[PDB]
Design a protein around this nucleic acid. Structure first.
Lengths: 123, 114, 53, 209, 17, 120
RNA sequence: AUGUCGGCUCAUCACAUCCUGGGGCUGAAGUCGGUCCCAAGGGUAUGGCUGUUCGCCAUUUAAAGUGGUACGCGAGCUGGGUUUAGAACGUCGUGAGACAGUUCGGUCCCUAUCUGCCGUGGGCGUUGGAGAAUUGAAAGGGGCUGCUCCUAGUACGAGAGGACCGGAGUGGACGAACCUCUGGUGUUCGGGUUGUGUCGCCAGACGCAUUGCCCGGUAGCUAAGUUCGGGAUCGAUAACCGCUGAAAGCAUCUAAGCGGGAAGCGAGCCUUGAGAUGAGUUCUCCCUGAUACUUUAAGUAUCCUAAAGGGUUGUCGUAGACUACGACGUUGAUAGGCAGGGUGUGUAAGCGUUGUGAGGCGUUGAGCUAACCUGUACUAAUUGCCCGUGAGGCUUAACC
RNA sequence: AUUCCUUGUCGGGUAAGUUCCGACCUGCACGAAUGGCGUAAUGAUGGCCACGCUGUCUCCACCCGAGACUCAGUGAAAUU
RNA sequence: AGGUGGUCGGGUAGAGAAUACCAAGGCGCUUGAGAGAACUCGGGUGAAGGAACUAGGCAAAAUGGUACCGUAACUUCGGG
RNA sequence: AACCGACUAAUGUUGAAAAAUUAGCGGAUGACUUGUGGCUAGGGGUGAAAGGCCAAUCAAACCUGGAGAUAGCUGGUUCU
């Protein structure tokens, strides 16, 4: 349940440490991004020599959230902190080459298959 | 309701291992990756248990790849294939949500050790 | 906030058409023959024919 | 369309073998018995009237009791009517059971919604609240303007205001049937059904099917 | 054009003396 | 909405209600019959009749429980020595409310409430 | 004494249409566009800056329409700007002062009578009365739309690219019902703990300190949760396209005649609905007494009767401001209690044991446990009183 | 606290800054005790930014009380 | 529910005449009783987010003690 | 802290109150604050200066008198 101004950790090695959702993309008046949802983000804090710099506006896919995800048996998976993976703003393909921390099977699909392949865990 | 009770007790799992808050459990969770059906193990501490017949649940908190993860399971769901209690914990409370704010040494639970 | 025209006696009367009072449900005690609010004890302390106070 | 008159028992779930939970409302359909057949010749339309359940004999008026006696059904908890459209022929006393919905994939359920009493425009109509601070004087959950000055100089009919909420006939549409239990006279219907437990519900095959 | 008016007294009720 | 909720506020805080009912129970145990307002009588049953049940089993634990709920040693003794023994066989309904008209001063609906099977 | 800018809240209408739908022309290959015609059903950004409206910018969206409504809306809110009194800068003036310049600061009242509107009752009526079930004249609600896949890398195109038509899926926003789940709340449940006071003391409790603080949490309510909705279809149409066809030997969609044709229109879906005084329909139930009197009526009076049923009273409710509505009222589970269970809390007290002691351990998952579940007449639900009558005018027709 | 044109221009800060900070000087209309320019400390002073914090807001939900509602007693008001 | 000079000031805790709970002593504030709608007032909690609110973080939330450690620019050498 | 004050907000605005309450806020050995009594008086006083204050009144107090000022203005002006 990410919205404009929400800060997210970077689950990637793109060079962002912290990003801020600028826009929930998708529909008119769409309030919230969930896991799987692409958001426009601004890089608020980045590592010294990385692919992305402070202030770089780009896309990102939310991969972990405190609100988490309901599964069809009624289960719910919640993460301690909100994270995302920066994507090329045109191609929507991950900037980084390594994912940090678990992800969910909600990313499973054609779009974010690389993320799922690289993630240390998929819950 | 006797009607709802009859309907619920037909669906209830027969033999579930006794676990308690503070236990370290390993839940074997049924995952289906396209066609293939495997078991995936969720190992962590029981921090909460809802006793509500078929509506029973339990929350397990693990720290995975540097990330806190909690999962509320529905005990009687088919998806939960098995629960193994690895360690019995000694706690003084029903719900260990205080563990959300602890880490490492602070997050350790005492063994019950009959 | 306030009327622009004093209200007639007629319309005042029309408003108070619902202001009439309704009487209490009474009954008579079997033993004491004393009228009482139905379901309530009498003044002499009977209720449904027995002295209860 | 023909339907049944159930009582909402409560909600529950049905675990599928594939580890999907299904939120179900359990409707108990005690055998419905036809108490009057209305025809075009007698009544100007084709319908059945059905009763369900039982009423304490003591609680049944003479007018009510004669109507049931004429059908040769025992008094039930009320009377509900189902229009017929297919030229379907029922007789009085004829029972209707949950087994009606053995082929039915989706039904339309109708009950009386729970009553929320007098409710303000914020809850009743999803009005936005006004500012909680920043100067607002006694007007936090106030409904705002209710019109538009000299023209038209009046409040338009149907203007959303505070008032009684709930306790109204409501029909949900296209609720899936998860299970018909003929033994226990149950329908398990996916999702929410109007009103509280114990309320009468009319179940009918879905009109938009 | 709209000429900003002075329609009301500068001190407002309930103090308006 | 108050759907399915229990307990009257009686135009009081919680701490006041708790105090008031503790008092009122002590009065009812002591005098075996008490005139109150009818809504207070109806609430009092949910306070007194559980004290009487507790008093049916005599234990240091139960006396202390009763003391906690009444803070009266005369009441606790009467509960465990008299009222428990009296109501031993009886399965609930230790009290009886008799409606008794209106109070003069405020025309409040009043009622007597009494213990059942008073020796008097 | 008709409050004046902007915002907020809440809107309502027009159509000169922003999107979505239907079309003609195109300098329309396709994909896109342009332009015009039809169309007002629904829909129609959030932020940065500024008091701003606006605008610029960032990032969205199918789209971010243009207007009217006292430049809609201050007895609905705000009061940043304008609008007083203070003070200062620039400037003008010898000066008091001034500026359509700037700057800092600077009290926004009203318990709603009437109309109106949202709700919710009471009265009477609807022609004997009563209990039900209904018909539908009428009205209201709803009406949005993205992306993906298939059709198909097909049609089209040198290529790059890339469809119509049709079908399937999954969203956004909006709405609804609901509480099984996920959660919130939970001063009515359980516990820990600080200070203090008290219960003679110890032990154990209780009061008070924001529920003292802290941790959980039942029921209910509830959204972030769950589920469902928008339609299809029929009919009539708009622009538009025709068929046949003269006037006008031809031609011509039109004059006669017959078609196609829109998110729009009438139905279709949901809700209300016979105060629809045009007061409807159906089913069932109840009342088949005397007399006198008159200026003889649909008359009056007395007596006898007091029905079906309605109320008042009572126990109450997932119903409720009051009402109303609904359940129950002993031929009884309506409420409370009580039993058993569940749930929650988390191993009571006492006693024993261990330790110098704080404390640990056993008894013990103990004790306590609200609004829950199943039961249970233990307590409380009194046919007492009212009200409602006594076969229901007349005319005409047809039937007997 | 002065600049009209004007949101001057450039730089910083922000995804985006008519405000803010630095700077430029075509100062409409600064300027030296109506003091000029600085200035540590101080300020319920003006502007701006950041962290923390949050029901301020997305977008409200629930709960505790006092009113509101009902009964009984008392009993105004502007207005007309 | 305002204002009004002086005197006296117990216990536990506490630096204290603060504060909490009490003593001595004094009071329950001269309408009550119900109910548990909207909305108003005064409070409590809040998923995810965290100033996106707004003229403006207004209001709330937050911080909060003692001892020790440690503490920058700048400075009028005191400070800060 | 007392005491003196009055920066913000909310309430209140036919108030509990003709300026308060609640939560916060400033000063708190001093150009402090307070009691009692004195003195200054209306074109006069007094003013760390707001045209502030001088008895809920102030760009000239209040009372009485001149006085029925004056009012080219407004209202009103009575039977057939």
């Amino acid at each position: 349940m990410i919205q404009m101004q929400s800060m997210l950790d970077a689950a990637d090695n793109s060079g962002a440490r912290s990003v801020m959702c600028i826009k929930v993309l998708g529909g008119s008046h769409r309030r919230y991004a969930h896991i799987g949802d692409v958001i426009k983000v601004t890089v608020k804090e980045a590592i010294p020599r990385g692919k992305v710099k402070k202030g770089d506006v780009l896309k990102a896919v939310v991969v972990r959230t405190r609100k988490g995800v309901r599964r069809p048996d009624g289960s719910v998976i919640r993460f301690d902190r909100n994270a995302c993976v920066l994507l090329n703003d045109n191609t929507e393909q991950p900037i980084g080459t390594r994912i940090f921390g678990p992800v969910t099977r909600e990313l499973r699909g054609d779009k974010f298959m690389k993320i799922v392949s690289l993630a240390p865990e998929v819950l | 309701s006797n009607i709802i009770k009859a309907l619920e007790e037909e669906q209830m799992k027969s033999d579930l291992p006794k676990f308690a808050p503070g236990d370290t459990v390993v839940v074997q969770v049924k995952v289906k990756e396209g066609d293939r059906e495997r078991l995936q193990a969720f190992e962590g501490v029981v921090i909460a248990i809802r006793n509500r017949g078929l509506h029973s649940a339990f929350t397990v908190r693990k720290i995975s790849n540097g990330e806190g993860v909690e999962r509320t399971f529905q005990t009687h769901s088919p998806i939960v294939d098995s629960i193994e209690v690895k360690r019995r914990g000694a706690v003084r409370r029903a719900k260990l949500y205080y563990l959300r704010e602890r880490s490492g040494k602070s997050a350790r639970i005492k063994e019950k050790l009959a | 906030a306030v009327q622009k025209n004093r209200k007639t006696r007629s319309k005042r009367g029309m408003r108070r058409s619902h202001d009439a009072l309704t009487t209490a449900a009474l009954s008579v005690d079997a033993t004491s023959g004393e009228t009482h609010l139905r379901h309530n004890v009498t003044a002499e302390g009977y209720y449904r024919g027995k002295k209860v106070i | 369309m023909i339907g049944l008159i159930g009582r909402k028992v409560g909600m529950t779930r049905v675990f599928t073998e594939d580890g999907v939970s299904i939120p179900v409302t359990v409707v108990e359909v005690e055998a419905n018995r036809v108490s009057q057949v209305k025809t075009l010749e007698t009544d100007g339309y084709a319908a059945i009237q059905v009763t369900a359940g039982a009423k304490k004999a003591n609680r049944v008026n003479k007018a009510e009791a004669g109507h049931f006696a004429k059908a040769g059904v025992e008094a039930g908890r009320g009377l509900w009517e189902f229009r017929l459209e297919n030229g379907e022929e029922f007789e009085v006393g004829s029972e209707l059971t949950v087994e009606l919905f053995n082929e039915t994939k989706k039904v339309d359920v109708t009950g009386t919604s729970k009553g929320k009493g007098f409710q303000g425009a914020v809850k009743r109509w999803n009005f936005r609240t006004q500012d909680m601070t920043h100067g607002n004087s006694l007007s936090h959950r106030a409904p705002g303007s209710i019109g538009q000055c000299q023209t038209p100089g009046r409040v338009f009919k149907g203007k959303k205001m505070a008032g009684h909420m709930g306790a109204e006939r409501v029909t949900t549409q296209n609720l899936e049937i998860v299970r018909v239990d003929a033994e226990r006279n149950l329908l398990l219907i996916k999702g929410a059904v109007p009103g509280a437990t114990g309320g009468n519900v009319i179940v009918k095959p879905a009109v938009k099917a | 054009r709209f000429r900003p008016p002075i329609r009301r007294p500068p001190i407002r009720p309930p103090f308006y003396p | 909405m108050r759907h399915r909720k229990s307990g009257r506020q009686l135009n009081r805080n919680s701490s006041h209600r708790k105090a008031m009912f503790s008092n009122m129970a002590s009065s009812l145990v002591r005098h075996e019959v008490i005139k109150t307002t009818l809504p207070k009588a109806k609430e009092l049953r949910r306070v007194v009749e559980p004290l009487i049940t507790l008093a049916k089993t005599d234990s240091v634990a139960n006396r202390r429980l009763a003391f906690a709920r009444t803070r009266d040693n005369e009441v606790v003794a009467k509960l465990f020595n008299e009222l428990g023994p009296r109501f031993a066989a009886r399965q609930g309904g230790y009290t009886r409310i008799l409606k008794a008209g209106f109070r003069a001063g405020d025309k409040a609906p009043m009622a007597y409430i009494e213990l059942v099977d008073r020796p008097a």
